[PDB]
Amino acid sequence: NTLNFVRFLELGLSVACICTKFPELAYVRDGVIQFEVQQPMIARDGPHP
Amino acid sequence: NTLNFVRFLELGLSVACICTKFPELAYVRDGVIQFEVQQPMIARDGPHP
């Protein structure tokens, strides 16, 4: 018998991740990702600060 | 992220009010509005007034 080979991209699970190659991953000590998120405002009056 | 800007008139609440600009509102002591409603009547007989 001959096996049926699966490629990772053919699967439906491949949508849940963003694959990227990186040859110099053995030299990396610690990687970080930064975020900047702002929020809207509601203007009111009365006994509300 | 980029904030999404909402304008008041684009809402469906804007049909519930008639907005108008008024620069000298702070010099209004007591703004006033009137109504003049008339009513019909029924002609009848008998010893009624």
Query: Is B14:B8 a contact under the CB 8 Å cutoff?
Result: yes
In chain B, the residue whose alpha carbon lies closest to the alpha carbon of A36 is B1
The 3-state DSSP class for residue B13 equals helix
Q: What resolution does the deposited structure have, in angstroms?
A: 3.1
| Min distance B7 CA to chain A CA atoms (Å) | 13
Supply the DSSP symbol for B29. Answer: S
The 3-state DSSP class for residue B22 equals coil
| Min distance B11 CA to chain A CA atoms (Å) | 16
User: Over the Cα atoms of chain A, what is R_g?
Assistant: 24
Q: Name A36's Cβ contacts closer than 8 Å, sequence gap at least 6.
A: B1
Q: What CA–CA distance (Å, rounded) separates A47 from A45? A: 7
Q: What CA–CA distance (Å, rounded) separates B49 from B44? A: 10
Q: What CA–CA distance (Å, rounded) separates B8 from B14? A: 7
Q: What CA–CA distance (Å, rounded) separates A27 from A23? A: 9
Method: cryo-EM
- Cβ atoms within 10 Å of B43's Cβ, excluding its own: 4
Q: How is A1-49 classified by DSSP, letter by letter?
A: -------GGGSGGGGG------GGGTT-S----------------SS--
